Design a binder for this molecule. Sequence first.
Ligand SMILES: [Zn+2]
Ligand SMILES: [Zn+2]
Length: 77
Amino acid sequence: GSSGSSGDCYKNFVAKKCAGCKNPITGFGKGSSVVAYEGQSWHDYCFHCKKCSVNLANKRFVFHQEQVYCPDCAKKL
Ligand SMILES: [Zn+2]
Ligand SMILES: [Zn+2]
């Protein structure tokens, strides 16, 4: 861990892994389309409702049960 420093755990810099596909958010160039909230991040294609499957990329949503739900679906919750 931090103090124990056991095993072979050595890193220099880790990127914010998506909270939907569980993958590294790479992309070195000119332009980027990814959402961020509370530190976490979500690809433009990953950021979507977990009920109707609507693209909420850079749009309004509602965090609930460690998930995301558009203002509409949120009303059902
Ligand atoms: Zn993703
Ligand atoms: Zn929805």
